[PDB]
């Protein structure tokens, strides 16, 4: 199964979390005014592994600048018609260099847990301070904890969109340091009958403490906030 | 795909029928309405392609011997559990014999659409003709006559028992005289995890004139009723 978000899994992605309800528009608010609590007179955005750019189009109303880095080909097709007048690169949070700095940078829906070890996760952070303005702010939202992960967890639901039905069912398991999460699609509609599709995924389950210590190894002061978008909660750091 | 109504397939059968709604026991009540206006005093019951024998739990309270016939040997086994006092036998609808005859010979819920054409319809309806007693009756539930069948349509549905959650989705399609109906399943729960399961039968759109001519030519006055337990009708045979 694919675990790179390509092709019809990534054509599926925004259709099978709007209708697990996820609110890329309360979000974009809610981080709009964590990043000015902490940085008054932001102006500019950067959207690491931004997928397919839905935080992006909201916060673009919010920021006068909005730019993204996403590692799938796909994804970022999708984001690119998405966010037609932003740019959006091609890249690995693990190493990349824009030549330039914004008044945020945020890294949402567990995107880090693809990072796999201290050293990945302290090379992304360290990437997301070199991007960063002096006065502002940088945002992980982190997969589970080890503690606090369920695992045997299933998710199924389904939606209907332009005629087709669309099923989406998880089962995640504990495989050592990370979630394996495989997730099965079933698609059907009238015209173009029943395709099954899936992909599956290691998502790692960093330490609240990993994460602290790569915020600390990047120059960033780290606070964390329980609860979050996803239940996960939400990790802010300020360079210094 | 399989085509024959085994393995997990069969497991499944009874879950997927319950969460779309299929009441067994209303329509073995109706049945057993039906056969005593045609036969008052009717005692026996034949339950032809009996599948998981859900119809025959619920006869077994209206008549006094109830058995089946079924060509699963998985769903033929799920039956007789269900079923731990009656016979079942393993055999084929277009080709068995018992030598014994009973009140009704019943044949439920489209079973009759696995026959192939008008011989092996006839066939099966000869050898329901050779079952039933000359006081009794012989129902028959169609598959859907060709101007009644909707190319195109998708069945969907998620159900959940004993914490392993259950998709089921179905697309149909016209194919010569049959509905092609592909079905897929996506199973899954907290220790088993997740596993994908398919389906795929061909349904004979018999014509009404083709059932009454297999009716007629075993020997048994023919009636149609529209409606019936899944919208298809029901026909009813009277012998002599
Ligand atoms: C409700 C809940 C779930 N979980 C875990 C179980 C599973 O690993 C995940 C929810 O899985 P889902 O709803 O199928 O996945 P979600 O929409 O959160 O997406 C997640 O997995 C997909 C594959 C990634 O692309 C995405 N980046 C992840 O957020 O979170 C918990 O640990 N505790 C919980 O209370
Ligand atoms: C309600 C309805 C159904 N149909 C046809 C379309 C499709 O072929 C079928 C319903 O599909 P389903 O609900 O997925 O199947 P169902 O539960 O009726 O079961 C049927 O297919 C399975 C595979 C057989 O084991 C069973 N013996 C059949 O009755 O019936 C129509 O053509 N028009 C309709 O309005
Ligand atoms: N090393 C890497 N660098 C950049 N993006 C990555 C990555 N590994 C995975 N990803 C991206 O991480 C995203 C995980 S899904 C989350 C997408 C988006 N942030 C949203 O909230 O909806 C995918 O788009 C995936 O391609
Ligand atoms: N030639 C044949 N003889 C006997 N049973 C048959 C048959 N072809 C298909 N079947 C059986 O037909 C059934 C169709 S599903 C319907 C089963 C059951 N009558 C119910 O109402 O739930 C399956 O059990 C299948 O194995």
Same mark, same amino acid.
């Given at each position: 199964?694919?675990? &790179? %978000?390509?092709?019809?899994?990534?054509?599926?992605?925004?259709?099978?979390?709007?209708?697990?309800?996820?609110?890329?528009?309360?979000?974009?608010?809610?981080?709009?005014?964590?990043?000015? +609590?902490?940085?008054?007179?932001?102006?500019?955005?950067?959207?690491?592994?931004?997928?397919?750019? /839905?935080?992006?189009? !909201?916060?673009? &109303?919010?920021?006068?600048?909005?730019?993204?880095?996403?590692?799938?080909? &796909?994804?970022?097709?999708?984001?690119?018609?998405?966010?037609?007048?932003?740019?959006?690169?091609?890249?690995? /949070?693990?190493?990349?260099?824009?030549?330039?700095?914004?008044?945020?940078?945020?890294? /949402?829906?567990?995107?880090?847990?693809?990072?796999?070890?201290?050293?990945?996760?302290?090379?992304?952070?360290? +990437?997301?301070?070199? !991007?960063?303005? =002096?006065?502002?702010?940088?945002?992980? @939202?982190?997969?589970?904890?080890?503690?606090?992960?369920?695992?045997?967890?299933?998710?199924?639901?389904?939606?209907?969109?332009?005629?087709?039905?669309? *099923?989406?069912?998880?089962?995640?398991?504990? @495989?050592?340091?990370?979630? +394996?999460?495989?997730? !099965? %699609?079933?698609?059907?509609?009238?015209?173009?009958?029943? *395709? !099954?599709?899936?992909?599956?995924? +290691?998502? *790692?389950?960093? *330490?609240?403490?990993?994460?602290?210590?790569?915020?600390?190894?990047?120059?960033?002061?780290? @606070?964390?906030?329980?609860?979050? =978008?996803?239940?996960?909660?939400?990790?802010?750091?300020?360079?210094?």
């Amino acid at each position: 199964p694919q675990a &790179d %978000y390509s092709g019809e899994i990534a054509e599926l992605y925004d259709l099978v979390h709007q209708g697990k309800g996820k609110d890329y528009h309360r979000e974009a608010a809610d981080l709009a005014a964590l990043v000015r +609590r902490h940085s008054p007179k932001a102006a500019s955005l950067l959207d690491v592994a931004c997928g397919t750019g /839905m935080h992006l189009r !909201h916060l673009a &109303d919010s920021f006068g600048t909005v730019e993204g880095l996403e590692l799938s080909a &796909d994804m970022l097709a999708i984001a690119r018609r998405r966010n037609p007048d932003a740019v959006l690169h091609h890249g690995d /949070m693990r190493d990349f260099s824009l030549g330039r700095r914004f008044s945020a940078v945020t890294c /949402m829906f567990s995107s880090i847990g693809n990072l796999a070890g201290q050293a990945e996760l302290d090379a992304a952070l360290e +990437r997301f301070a070199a !991007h960063v303005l =002096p006065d502002g702010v940088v945002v992980v @939202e982190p997969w589970w904890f080890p503690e606090n992960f369920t695992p045997g967890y299933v998710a199924a639901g389904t939606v209907e969109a332009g005629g087709t039905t669309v *099923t989406r069912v998880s089962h995640s398991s504990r @495989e050592g340091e990370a979630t +394996r999460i495989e997730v !099965h %699609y079933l698609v059907a509609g009238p015209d173009r009958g029943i *395709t !099954h599709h899936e992909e599956s995924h +290691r998502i *790692t389950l960093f *330490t609240r403490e990993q994460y602290e210590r790569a915020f600390t190894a990047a120059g960033l002061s780290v @606070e964390f906030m329980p609860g979050g =978008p996803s239940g996960r909660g939400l990790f802010t750091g300020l360079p210094g």
